[PDB]
Amino acid sequence: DLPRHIAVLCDGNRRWARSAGYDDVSYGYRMGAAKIAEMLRWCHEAGIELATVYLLSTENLQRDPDELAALIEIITDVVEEICAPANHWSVRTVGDLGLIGEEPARRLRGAVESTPEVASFHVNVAVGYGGRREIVDAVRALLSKELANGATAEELVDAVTVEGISENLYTSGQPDPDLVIRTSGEQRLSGFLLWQSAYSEMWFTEAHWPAFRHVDFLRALRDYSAR
Amino acid sequence: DLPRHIAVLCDGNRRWARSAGYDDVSYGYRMGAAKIAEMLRWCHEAGIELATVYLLSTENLQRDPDELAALIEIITDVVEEICAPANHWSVRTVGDLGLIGEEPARRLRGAVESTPEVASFHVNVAVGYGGRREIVDAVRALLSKELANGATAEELVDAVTVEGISENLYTSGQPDPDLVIRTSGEQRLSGFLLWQSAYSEMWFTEAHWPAFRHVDFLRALRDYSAR
Known part of the structure; x- marks a missing residue:
């Protein structure tokens, strides 16, 4: 009825910023970052137990370092x-x-380790992530666990x-994504939560991520409910 | 511009048959089978190098045995x-x-082994298939292979x-799907070619599978191209 686990991919940060004619495309990431925060708040208040935001792909690490640095710092504030x-x-x-670098990884690890383990809202931040x-x-x-327990090479x-495999994924002990929100009119896959999302509902909107609004989120939930 | 590999998911048969007024859902499957034959001709003539058709999933194998018996007969003729x-x-x-019975297994395997290894057009039929x-x-x-090369436990x-892993799947040595077509408006995933289609375009239609027309196939290539 309600998604137990919503997964969000934030496409169209640069594309959005170019539409509005922003010469400086890192700006798109700032607005996308603001939006992630608002999204998590919406999820949280809707009563959704787990949200997984796509922050950084091995794909994104192919970008120019002048902009990658901006993006890495933005991810870290988020x-x-x-x-x-x-x-x-x-x-x-x-x-x-x-894959993200020494000082930012430190800041990120410090932030995440300070959070409780028991809570009523859970967030997974996907950074340095590839599905295969x-x-x-x-x-x-x-x-390795099987070898540690004494399994032979034949066994x-x-x-x-x-x-x-489920037990040993990053998302070990969590529910699989019930709904996968994809944006900017993208109907491509990214191999995001590749194994766990094998049976998730896809939902698409044309709106670029920085332009995603609460009205779109309620549309997403209604569409999920109506399937 | 044009896909190398198109993968197709043929949902809606039973729903289509019940929509037409038949007491026997096997009319839908028989009509789906006609549509597969037509689809494959279209792919071939369009210039597509590999087609993957999803005939029978492990989910489907849990059906009523007399309906599955009759489905597998239709798949075999297909x-x-x-x-x-x-x-x-x-x-x-x-x-x-x-997983499908010995007589269908024999018939299917002898039909396929009779086809050439080198051809301008290749077809995968997915029977008894599951992604994970x-x-x-x-x-x-x-x-198993590397153990036979005399590898140690820790090796x-x-x-x-x-x-x-890409080498040891059923699609060994084949191009990954570019475009994945799913029917009955199902925006689920069902883990069809899970690993290989990590980065494939998805295209959706509301039409049940036995209603698929050449024009939709044309609309799918038009969307793929403009993306």
Whole structure:
């Protein structure tokens, strides 16, 4: 009836800013960041237990460093606001922080570790995230645990299961995404929460992320309800 | 401009049959089967190199046995027609044929093995297929091979890679889908070609599968191209 877990991909930050004729396209990320905060607030008040925001892809790391640095700092403010003690939200990083750089990773880890584990609203921040690699790391995690418990090489070949992989993903012990909000008219996949979102409802809007409004969010929820 | 690989999901058969007034939902499946044959001709003539058709999922295998019996008969005739040597189409099967009964397994496998290996047009038929289940089996094929190369327990733990899984799936050595077409307005995912379609375009229509027309197929290529 209500999504137990909503996943949001924020497409169209640069495209949005170019439409309005902003020469300086990092501006789009600032507005997208403001919007993420408002989205989490909407989710939170709607009664949704888990929201997963897409903050950074291995794709995004192919951008020009003059703008990537701006984007990395923006992501870090966003996370430090999500983790603010006044929210009392439980926060988890989904992805590798080994790709974003030393000082920002530090700031991000510091912020997320200060949040409670028990809460009524949970947020996953997807940073340094790729879906096929999540799956690969879940398999190696699974196979190290089996080796630690004393499995032989013959017994490992058969240790892999669908439950074992779920348990060893970044989103271990969480519900799978019930609804996947995709924006800027994008009907492409990104391999975001690739394994977990195998059976999620897709919802699309034409609006670019910085232009996403509460009225669009209620449309999303109604459409989910009506399916 | 134009897809190399189009994957198709044929939902709505039963709903279509009940919409037309039939007491027997097998009219929908028989009509879906006609539509598959037509679809494949369209792809071929349009210039598409690989088509993937989703014939039977592991979900579907839980049906009433007498309805599944009759569905699998329809699927078998579908594949036998697809493999007609007039076509000179290359056919692979994608999924566990060990789930559908021995006589259908034999008939299907002998129709496909009779098709050429080198052809201008390739067709995948997905029978007894599941996305997460396909990943698990690719992993176990991977580890099985390297054990046979005399790898140690701890060597197996590290052997799993993205490129290693891409090699051991049912779609081994084939291009990933560019475009994925789903029907009955279902904006779910159902894990069809989960790994391979991580970065594919999705195209949706409200029309049940047995109502699919050449014009929708044209609308799908037009949307794909303009994206």
